[PDB]
Amino acid sequence: MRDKWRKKRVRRLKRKRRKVRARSK
Amino acid sequence: GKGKPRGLNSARKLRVHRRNNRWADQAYKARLLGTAFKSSPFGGSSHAKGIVLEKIGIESKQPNSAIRKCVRVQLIKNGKKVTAFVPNDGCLNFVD
Amino acid sequence: GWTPVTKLGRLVKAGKITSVEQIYLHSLPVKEYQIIDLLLPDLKDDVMKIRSVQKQTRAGQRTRMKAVVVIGDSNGHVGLGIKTAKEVASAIKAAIVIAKLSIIPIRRGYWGSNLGQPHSLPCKVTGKCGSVAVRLIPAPRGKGIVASPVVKRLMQLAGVEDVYTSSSGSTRTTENTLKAAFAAIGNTYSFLTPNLWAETPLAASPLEVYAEEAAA
Amino acid sequence: PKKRASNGRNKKGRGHVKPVRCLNCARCVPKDKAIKRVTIRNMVEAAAVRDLSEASVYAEYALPKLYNKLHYCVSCAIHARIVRVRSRTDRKIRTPPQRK
Amino acid sequence: MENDKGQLVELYVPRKCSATNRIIKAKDHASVQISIAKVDEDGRAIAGENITYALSGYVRGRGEADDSLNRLAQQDGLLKNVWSYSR
Amino acid sequence: GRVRTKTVKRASKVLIERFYPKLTLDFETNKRLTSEIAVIQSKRLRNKIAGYTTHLMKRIQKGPVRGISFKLQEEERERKDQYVPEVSALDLSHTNGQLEIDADTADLVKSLGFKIPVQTVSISA
Amino acid sequence: SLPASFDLTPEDAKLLLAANVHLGAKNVQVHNKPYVYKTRPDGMNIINIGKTWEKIVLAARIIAAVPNASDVAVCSSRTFGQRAVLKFAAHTGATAIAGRFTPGNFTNYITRSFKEPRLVVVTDPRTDAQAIKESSYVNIPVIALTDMDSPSEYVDVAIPCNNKGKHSIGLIWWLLAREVLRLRGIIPDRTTEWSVMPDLYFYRDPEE
Amino acid sequence: TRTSVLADALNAINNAEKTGKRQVLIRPSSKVIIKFLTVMQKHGYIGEFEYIDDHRSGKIVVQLNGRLNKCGVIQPRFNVKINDIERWTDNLLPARQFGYVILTTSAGIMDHEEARRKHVSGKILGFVY
Amino acid sequence: VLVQDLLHPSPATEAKQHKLKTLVQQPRSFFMDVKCQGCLNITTVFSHAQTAVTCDSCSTVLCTPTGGKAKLTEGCSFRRK
RNA sequence: GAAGAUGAUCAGAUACCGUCGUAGUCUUAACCAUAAACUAUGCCGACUAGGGAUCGGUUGUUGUUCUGACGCAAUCGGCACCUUACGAGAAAUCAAAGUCUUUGGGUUCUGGGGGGAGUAUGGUCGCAAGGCUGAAACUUAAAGGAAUUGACGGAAG
Ligand SMILES: [Mg+2]
Ligand SMILES: [Mg+2]
Ligand SMILES: [Mg+2]
Ligand SMILES: [Mg+2]
Ligand SMILES: [Mg+2]
Ligand SMILES: [Mg+2]
Ligand SMILES: [Mg+2]
Ligand SMILES: [Mg+2]
Ligand SMILES: [Mg+2]
Ligand SMILES: [Mg+2]
Ligand SMILES: [Mg+2]
Ligand SMILES: [Mg+2]
Ligand SMILES: [Mg+2]
Ligand SMILES: [Mg+2]
Ligand SMILES: [Mg+2]
Ligand SMILES: [Mg+2]
Ligand SMILES: [Mg+2]
Ligand SMILES: [Mg+2]
Ligand SMILES: [Mg+2]
Ligand SMILES: [Mg+2]
Ligand SMILES: [Mg+2]
Ligand SMILES: [Mg+2]
Ligand SMILES: [Zn+2]
Ligand SMILES: [Zn+2]
């Protein structure tokens, strides 16, 4: 896939990881 | 001037630069990180004994088509489970 | 039955020119392989590599055979020829012809003392072709040709007894390796050393002293 | 690889050049990169310059010209055949084509 | 080049460029050897009696051959007030 | 079309380069001559060859043709182009008797050990 | 050195100046700077015809040093020099190459007019680039008639003159022919008037 | 900036010799440059050279005779013991029979053969062959 | 040009060079003796003067500074020393 | 004019096209610190080749118009360009990407087969978006660069 969209997908997945970890801090 | 110091008193810079850059060499990195000691199933040894758990056939990769006859072995020294190929025509019948 | 078509060929068919060093002294171009055959009768060739190259066409590949030939007399003369032809045998025959046409002299020198005949090179030399650079270093009387078999064969046919070698780049490209080594071995008569500092008079060309024998 | 030594534009000794809109599609194109053509056309077509001169109330009245400078992006110009694909060696030629 | 016993083991002592002193190689086909006739007091060319110069292909490729001949011939008397040392 | 091929074009110009004195401007005579000069396998090729040889001869008689040399073109040309006028057109007699060189060149003439009369012309443009 | 009889005579200087030999091109390359006497205010460069004369004598002496006269090849692709080189060949016995020079005449040994000249003389280095280029493949020295803009690559002896003149080309070629015959002894001495006139060697249009 | 005038001098000499020029201009001059040139001249690698005084560092015009293959500096000026001269001559010189490694020793600037004659060693300075 | 006299350049080409690019650098400027029209009193003025120099006798400006050589006022004649 | 609303096309298009449109676009106070932030080419110094233009300054000079402009010469500095290839390069190409096995002018930074991955973890900066620093397990025989011939193109002739 396009590198720019691959980067966007990974950024959204890092964002999700951070939000998920914040629940239990 | 080739991008590296040449002064007669720049031995520290040359030695440190080489030391920083040898970490890009995976052989040196694996030797100093001790990955065989920490990560390798054998723990750095050449051989290792274990107990056969089950006999398993593994499909070969393309373009080959065959059933490579291996076993699942649990190592005595650390309890890790590995897959080991049984070489030659019909030596799987020797492994129980 | 060879009928020369060049002035040099006529002068060699007659006894006017008797050695290749007279050719080299005046840089005369050699275009007829019979000149080299007459002046260097004892030449040994070697097919160093045969390769198949393909040209894609509408119907399919068009394959031709490429031959690399090294010629030499083991006494200071060596040549190199590369030719493509439909057939291997014809490619080899024509590469032998142009290897003869390219035969150059080399300068043998001494590592250390000048006792006996020259056995090595007189100086360090280097040649480059493509990415391959071949360096030849003079070596003592014991060490043979310290080189890969490709460069070693060229050294043997050139008459070098003792030499160190070092190559860099994609040495597996045999044609480039041989061309680089051939350039290096030919640079021995291009490197000015102090024993060659003396001025020598410019002799008249043999095409000048024998103008009438080369006429027609 | 690099296709043009000028990178397809005309920016040397400069950092940034403000854009212009393609006449045909309104695409933002750098001013140095845009294909620019100056056209000076007669305002009345040669077929009608006669009947309009006969209908004119002025003896010796000169018909005005139409002055315009057109800016095209690379796609606009190639599509409209203002410029065409040239051979590798013919690309370097930057003199105006010898037609006029 | 000679051995311990004195024999000239060198084959083919090569020529050198008159302008640059470079060795003229066996396959330097851009190199030339100019031969200029000697002229007797009657204005006649003396048969088989020449001033000879050699130029490497490097000098000829650079276009310096003409100016080098102007200098060499003026120093050898073949020319007068055509080449100037100071530019 | 009626474009002759190379087998007739080169065979005709070999005839011209080899038998120009014996050739002529008549097709019937050329046709008979090339039947005794060349071994032509077919009558049609013989007629094509003679018709183009005749055409080439007819063109040679009107002036020199490019690519054909028949051992008399240059022999006639060597003494055809020998014309030289009695006055040299470079001799300083067309003028008043002295050079029309520019004054700057006159300085070069004075620099050399020469005393040459001069009418200096200064275009200065 | 050389007898004083070889100096530039006033008669030859008159011919050279009347033939506009001294008018060199507007733009001069760095290698031809020694041959320029002064630049004329219009832009033309004045050629030091004393040097032109001396180069002519040197070139003729090189031509005279070649044993077989046919081994000298005289070339001209320009139409203005074709008659000059043809008459030069007629008078001296050289081998003329007038008009187009077939590529491969010196390197391709199966071509029709494959020659092996010991010396190549050129009317113009620019329009005879092919002859100079091939001579640099087979070790042929080159004498060239050079203007102030003429390239000097692979040109050994340069005769500074006007290459683009109808009378200049013919005069320079005529002067070489006269000196080559004087050195060979065909002309008894340096004072006998030559039968040939500088009008011969001048290009003639097909009109006449 | 200008860190080695000897390197600049030798680079100018190399470029002129490679282009076939028979003379080269060096600026600035120095004692080390002059003594390096004196070693080259004594061994015949250059001809006469000329020092021009400009009430500054100076200038030099060197006559080249076409015998010079390459001259160069070794930066930095490594300390060289007598037993290290063999390593330097092996790496730098084209053959064992000609060429010189120039050293600056407390006995003066000299080639490696003279240094062996008087049994002295110093810092390496350059080479010539 | 392969052979050339670097120690004795032609003075014509030597004069076109920049003042720092000669064999020995030398200024192209000079000093002048300025005669104002009113009286006769030697006043030494630099050719490339940066000051509006006035002569001692009469308080009249001799030159006006410019980018290069100073420009002498009308009626002022200079003679190079 | 992101988002959104809407009319077309389409098998479907909440895409391309059309009409509107909210953040934004502008500005003031602060943040953010990233771009194919590119000449994909670190900075300082020296040398090596021809040529014509051009901008700024200076210095000498016209069959020119009216002091200025222009014209002709030199020069220093720039932005570039044209030719050649001595030279370099795998080549494309390069007056630097040259003066590099004939390997050493000074110095900073960066890379070490392809992925995993600029991910996880720790730290730090940020209001956030995120920035900077930054692995490993495992997996893999190529990935890639430049060019050649062909084939194809809803590219041109
Ligand atoms: Mg130090
Ligand atoms: Mg390797
Ligand atoms: Mg592309
Ligand atoms: Mg930008
Ligand atoms: Mg000192
Ligand atoms: Mg010391
Ligand atoms: Mg829809
Ligand atoms: Mg809107
Ligand atoms: Mg805002
Ligand atoms: Mg930002
Ligand atoms: Mg970045
Ligand atoms: Mg960019
Ligand atoms: Mg980057
Ligand atoms: Mg930096
Ligand atoms: Mg620099
Ligand atoms: Mg340097
Ligand atoms: Mg200016
Ligand atoms: Mg100044
Ligand atoms: Mg370029
Ligand atoms: Mg550039
Ligand atoms: Mg990696
Ligand atoms: Mg590709
Ligand atoms: Zn577009
Ligand atoms: Zn006063």
Q: How far apart are CA G137 and CA F55, in angstroms?
A: 42
Question: Resolution reached, in Å?
Answer: 2.5
Report the residue from E20, E68, E85 with minimal CB separation from I5.
E85
Phi/psi class of residue B72: alpha, beta or left (left: φ > 0; alpha: ψ in -120 to 50)? beta
I28 residue type, one letter: R
CB contact at 8 A, H43 and H71:
no
Chain breaks in chain D (C to N over 2.5 A) after: none
Chain breaks in chain G (C to N over 2.5 A) after: none
Q: How far is CA H108 from CA H74, H123, H124, in A?
A: 17, 11, 12
Assigned token pair, I11: 């003075």
| Nearest alpha carbon to residue G51 among F111, C130, C126 | F111
CB contact under 8 A, C211 and G68: yes
Assigned token pair, G162: 């006007």
Q: How far apart are CA G159 and CA G171, in angstroms?
A: 12
DSSP lists the bridge partners of residue F118 as: F99
Chains contacting chain A through 3 or more C-beta pairs under 8 A:
none
Q: Which residues contact E85 (CB under 8 A, 6 or more apart)?
A: I3, I4, I5
Angle at F19 between CA F18 and CA F23, to 5 degrees: 150
Q: How far apart are CA C185 and CA C77, in angstroms?
A: 10
* Cα end-to-end span (Å), chain D: 35
Does the annotation place D25 within a ligand binding site?
yes
Crossing angle of helices G10-18 and G166-184, rounded to 10°? 150
Q: Which alpha helices (H) appear in chain D, and where do they start and end?
A: 48-55, 74-79
Angle at G200 between CA G195 and CA G204, to 5 degrees: 165
**How many whole angstroms from B55 Cα to the centroid of ligand 6?**
75
Chain C, residues 28-67, CB within 8 A of chain G, namely 28-29, 31
Q: Which of H75, H77, H80 to mutate to test the interface with B (most CBs of B within 10 A)?
A: H75
Could you identify the residue whose CA is nearest to the C1' atom of nucleotide J99?
H15
Beta strands I44-46 and H123-128, pairing class: unpaired
| Nearest alpha carbon to residue F64 among F19, F16, F28, F117 | F16
Residues of G with Cβ-Cβ distance to E66 under 8 angstroms: 31, 146, 152, 155-158
Assigned token pair, F119: 């009418």
- The three-state secondary structure class of C163 is strand
CB contact under 8 A, H23 and I6: yes
Q: Which residue of G has its CA nearest to C7?
A: G116
CA C114 to chain centre: 25
G140 residue type, one letter: I
Q: Give per-residue burial for C96-131: e unless 16+ CB within 10 Å, then b.
A: bbbbbbbbbbbbbbbbeebeeebbbbbbbbbbbbee
Strands (E), G62-130: 72-76, 95-98, 119-122
**Count of CB atoms situated within 10 Å of the CB of G86:** 22
Q: Which residue of H has its CA nearest to C193?
A: H98
**How many whole angstroms from D2 Cα to the centroid of ligand 23?**
21
Bases of chain J with protein Cβ within 7 A: 39-52, 57-60, 63, 74-76, 78-83, 86, 89-94, 97-113, 117-121, 129-130, 136-138, 141, 145-147, 149-151, 155-157
Q: How far is CA D5 from CA D74, D88, D92, E11, G138, in A?
A: 17, 12, 9, 51, 38
- Chain I contact for H65, CB < 8 A? no
Assigned token pair, C211: 């103008």
Using CB atoms within 10 A of its CB, is residue I79 exposed (0-12), middle (13-18) or buried (19+)? exposed
Q: How far apart are CA C107 and CA C122, in angstroms?
A: 7
**How many whole angstroms from D91 Cα to the centroid of ligand 12?**
19
A4 touches strand J (CB under 7 A): no
Q: How far apart are CA C172 and CA C176, in angstroms?
A: 9
Using CB atoms within 10 A of its CB, is residue H70 exposed (0-12), middle (13-18) or buried (19+)? middle
CB contact at 8 A, C106 and C190:
no
F56-F59-F60-F65 Cα dihedral, nearest 10 degrees? -80
- Chain H contact for C112, CB < 8 A? yes
- Chain H contact for I7, CB < 8 A? yes
Q: How far apart are CA H121 and CA H126, in angstroms?
A: 14
Experimental method: cryo-EM
Q: How far apart are CA C154 and CA H82, in angstroms?
A: 39
Assigned token pair, D77: 């110009």
D1 touches strand J (CB under 7 A): yes
- Chain E contact for H65, CB < 8 A? yes
Instruction: Calculate how close chain B gets to H77, using CA atoms only, in Å.
Output: 7
DSSP secondary structure of B42-79: TTT-S---EEEEEEEEEEPPTT---EEEEEEEEETTT-
Q: How far apart are CA F24 and CA H23, in angstroms?
A: 73
Chain breaks in chain F (C to N over 2.5 A) after: none
